[PDB]
Each structure stands twice: as C-alpha cells, then as structure tokens.
C-alpha cells in the first residue's frame, strides 16, 4: 500500500535549512507554488497544441486556492499536466540535487531564501509554513497518487482512491500552528495581488 | 531546402510591438535568453537522471556568450536539450499565442516590457537589439536545424549542414547598427552580473 523513500541527502539538508533558519518573509511559499502550477499548466497547453486529445481529461486551465480553517490546510489545485509516480519519486519532477547545490552556493554568495525558485526547488518553500505537505497528482499517462512528507528525511507515495481529479496537482499544506494567517481571505488576496498578479491562468480564491 | 512559415497573428503582433515601442531598458534581452538556456539545460539534466545515455551527445552543461565585432553578432550557445523541427515551427517550444494574450493584457493592467518572460515569450525580446535572429538547434531525437527571422511576419526553417553541435541551441543575434555595446566585454559582464548572477550552470564570456 504505502511505499517509503529517503530524501536524497541534499534535499533532506535543504528541508532542514528551510525549517530551521529564522526567516520572516514566509509568504513567498505561495508565489512558488502558483508558479509551479503555472509551469505545469503551460506544459499541458503546449502538449495539447499538437495533440488536442490531451485535454479530454479537462479543458479548463486554472488554479484554485482553497483554505479550510477547520482542517488547518491551504490547498493549491491546478489542472496542469500532473506528475507520474516516477516523477513524484524523482523529487516531484525537479532537478533537486543540483538545484540545492546551486542554491546553497548562492546562499554563500549573498542570496536569501526568497530566491529559492530561481534554482528550481521552490516547492520546498512549502516547509516555511507547513508541517506536513500532501501532493495528490494525476497525469494522463498514469494513475492518481498521493506523495506525502512531514520532512525528517523521508516521504511516502501511495495510490490515491479518494476523489479522482481527472488531471492536475493538489498541494495540501497542513499549516503550522502559528502560521494560520495564510488561511485568511484578506491575507491570501494580498499575497496573490503582490507576488502573482501577472500569471496567465485564472486564480480563484475559495471562500469558507 | 528552405521552408517559410507565417508567424501566428499574435506573435507577429508581439514582434512589431517589441520592435516599435520606445523602451530604453533593452538589456533584459540577455537575461531572457540565458534564462531559456538554463531551462533547456534543466530539461536535459532531468532526463539524464533516469536515462544517462541522453548525455552521450555531450556531458557538459553550460552556456557560452560569444561576441564577434566583425560580424556584428552576439551568440548564446547552451548544451541544453535542444529543439526538434516540430518544436521550432511551433513557436520555438513556447505557448506563444496565449503567452502574448496574457502579456498584452498585463501590459494593459500596468506591466512593462521587462516582464515579457513571466509570460513565457522572453525569446522575442531578442528583437529589442537584433534585426535578424538565427537559432541553430540539435535535439537527440532529430537532425540539426536553423530557424531564422528578421521579423516582418515570417520565419524560415532549414536543415543545418555546417558545424554539427552535438546537442543544444545557439541563438545568433545579428545586432542592430546602434546596439553594438552588447558586443563589449565590459557591457556583457555588467549585465550578467546584474541580471543572471545566480544561474545554476557556468556562463563563459568569450574574448576577441
Ligand atoms: C513533468 C510532468 N509534470 C510536471 O512538471 C508537473 N505537474 O504538476 C506539477 C506541479 C508541481 C508542483 C511541485 C509539487 C513541484 C506544484 O506545486 C504544482 C504543480 O502543478 C508539475 C511540476 C511543476 C513544476 C516543477 C518544478 N519546476 C521548477 C523549475 O525547474 C523545472 C521544474 C516540477 C513539477
Ligand atoms: C522542449 C524541448 N526543448 C526545449 O525546451 C529547448 N531547447 O533549447 C531551447 C532554447 C530555446 C530558446 C528560445 C529560442 C526559445 C533559447 O533562447 C535557448 C534555448 O536553449 C529550448 C527552449 C527553452 C525555453 C523555451 C521557453 N520556455 C519559457 C517559459 O515557458 C516554457 C518554455 C522554449 C524552448
């Protein structure tokens, strides 16, 4: 049922850095995730240009932000290309080993955490505000899976049997106790207007 | 031998905008191209993780900037994944129709040209300083081609028989008469230090 994997040593080191380094500008985590969703949404667009049947799993390309104060989660859903089990296991489709190399090296030469995404490892900025992150994903070439980690050197991957989503990725952020501002309508609007104003797909902020 | 294609109406409109709009900050064009090269270099890295034989066409991943004052060209070569003829014809691998949509719409709502790359059409910023742009490209799954355009609503694609490059892309900028500062060692250093300091691959500035 549940498979458990060790993070590579560098990712495990990146995550510990993210979690442990005092750094107040935690809000960038949302920009980095909406920017991954946009990327994943570009890819399915690009693919559907030459093969229109790639969109049979959903023709709408968009991003939804869904807070839930009862569960203490913020969830970014996109109808992008999604990831295959292989992609999930190989660091969620990213060049994360060499990306963390570059990033640590940049951190040496005068970069701050907010720059994480120029190394292609922006996803991990989720650990700025979340204590567990769950990624449900569905790519056309594969079944639906859920990747999950509370950091600590390991992640899990299982097949997901709850709500088929048809196509895309859902990043559920189980927020830290003291990071619940990110569940506020007003606070999320502010960050999307500030950091993600010019994204080429609709972003819908759901209400509770 | 030479095939000739019409730009889609929007790209042709984007290019005319780029060429015709007074906008002094022309130097961003280099950031946008080094950033495409980095992206193309990420992709071959990601692919080679699971299939190491993808690197048989070259194991070095890097970017070279090569001015030539005699020919009045600046050339950005990368050993990235390269593009197939299909990719070249379909707007150099980009979602350019909807990207230009997004960009024009952003330009409405208060964005400037320097933001072009957040819509995935940064390549065309080459027309800020170049009167012709030639792209030689080689992907593992295809032969070597040269795409070329002086704008004006059409591009050409031929197969390239000069210097096999093994794998990657070469963007040759035939610079405009009054844009030759971009051929100066000092000026290029300045722009790379300013806009592209934290790129995860070596950038080599060649000397004349
Ligand atoms: C290759 C086939 N699929 C995908 O690329 C894909 N589908 O869904 C993706 C999403 C991934 C993330 C995180 C988990 C990496 C999201 O937050 C949202 C997505 O939609 C997603 C994806 C999107 C972005 C990235 C990271 N980029 C960052 C810059 O380097 C290249 C890769 C990795 C994966
Ligand atoms: C899909 C298989 N190949 C590639 O993606 C590829 N190989 O070489 C690429 C380069 C492209 C450009 C311009 C011509 C688009 C470069 O300037 C440099 C490259 O190395 C290149 C490429 C790199 C970037 C882009 C544009 N990005 C921009 C953001 O949206 C997604 C696509 C398009 C193509």
DSSP A131-168: EEEEEEEE-TTS-EEEEEE-SSSEEEEEE--SS--SSE
Does the CB atom of residue B80 touch ligand 2 within 6 A? Answer: yes
How many angstroms away from the CA of B149 is the closest CA of chain A? 22
Interface mutation target, options B85, B97, B118, B194, chain A, most CBs of A under 10 Å: B118
Of A115, A120, A200, the CB nearest to B102: A200
User: What 3-state DSSP class applies to A142?
Assistant: coil
Length of chain A: 208
Q: Is A152 exposed, middle or buried (0-12, 13-18, 19+ CB in 10 A)?
A: exposed
Q: How far apart are CA B81 and CA B55, in angstroms?
A: 10
B46 C-alpha to ligand 2 centroid (Å): 15
Beta-ladder partners of A130: A175
| Min Cα–Cα distance to chain A from B71, Å | 34
Residue B36 annotated as binding site: yes
Q: What contacts B145, CB < 8 A, 6 or more positions away?
A: B83, B85, B88, B136, B137, B138, B157, B158, B159, B160
Collect all residues of chain B within an 8 Å Cβ-Cβ radius of residue A34.
Answer: none
Question: Which two three-digit tokens encode residue A167?
Answer: 């196509």
Spatial neighbors of A139 by CB under 8 A, at least 6 apart, are A81, A82, A83, A84, A87, A167
Contact: B98, A45; criterion CB under 8 Å: yes
- Residue B83 in contact with ligand 2 by CB distance below 6 A: yes
Phi, psi torsion values for B168, nearest 5 degrees:
130, -165
**What is the domain partition of chain B in residue ranges?**
1-208
Nearest CA in chain A to B89: A50
Q: Which two tokens stand for residue B198?
A: 């934290």
Domain range B1-208, CATH class: alpha beta
Q: For chain B, first and last CA: distance in Å?
A: 33
Residues A152, A154, A160, A166, CA torsion sign: positive
Helix spans in B66-196 (H): 85-89, 96-108, 185-195
H/E segment holding residue A162: none
CB A41 within 8 A of CB A61: yes
Name the token pair of B189: 């250093």
Q: What angle do CA B53, B56, B58 make, to 5 degrees?
A: 135
Contact A98 B46 (CB under 8 A): no
SS3 B169: strand
Give A-chain residues touching B197 at CB under 8 angstroms.
109
Taking a C-beta distance cutoff of 8 angstroms, is the pair A208, A68 a contact? Answer: yes
**Locus of tokens 């050339």:** B75
Q: Is the CB of A77 under 6 A from ligand 1?
A: no
Two structure tokens written together for A17: 């850095």
Query: CA-nearest residue of chain A to B41?
Result: A95
Strand A130-138 versus strand A144-149 pairing type: antiparallel
Calculate how close chain A gets to B20, using CA atoms only, in Å: 23
For residue A147, the tally of other CB atoms under 10 A from its CB is 23
Which structure tokens are listed for B11?
């790209």
CA nearest A202 in B: which residue? B102
Instruction: Please list every residue in chain A whose beta carbon sits closer than 8 Å to the beta carbon of residue B93.
Output: 46
Q: Is B94 in the pocket of ligand 2 (CB under 6 A)?
A: yes
Atom of ligand 1 nearest to the CA of B43: 31
What tokens were used for B95?
């979602």
């Amino acid at each position: 049922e549940v498979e458990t994997f060790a993070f590579q040593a560098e990712i495990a080191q990146l995550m510990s850095l993210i979690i442990n380094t005092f750094y107040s500008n935690k809000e960038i985590f949302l920009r980095e995730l909406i920017s991954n969703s946009s990327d994943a949404l570009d890819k399915i667009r690009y693919e559907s240009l030459t093969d229109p049947s790639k969109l049979d799993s959903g023709k709408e390309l968009h991003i939804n932000l869904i807070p839930n104060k009862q569960d203490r989660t913020l969830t970014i859903v996109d109808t992008g290309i999604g990831m295959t089990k292989a992609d999930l296991i190989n660091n969620l489709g990213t060049i994360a080993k060499s990306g963390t190399k570059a990033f640590m090296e940049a951190l040496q030469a005068g970069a701050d955490i907010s720059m994480i995404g120029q190394f292609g490892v922006g996803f991990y900025s989720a650990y700025l505000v979340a204590e567990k992150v769950t990624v449900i994903t569905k790519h056309n070439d594969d079944e639906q899976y859920a990747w999950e980690s509370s950091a600590g050197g390991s992640f899990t991957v299982r097949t997901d049997t709850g709500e088929p989503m048809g196509r895309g990725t859902k990043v559920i952020l189980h927020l830290k106790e003291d990071q619940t501002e990110y569940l506020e309508e007003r606070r999320i609007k502010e960050i999307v207007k500030k950091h993600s104003q010019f994204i080429g797909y609709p972003i819908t902020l759901f209400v509770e």
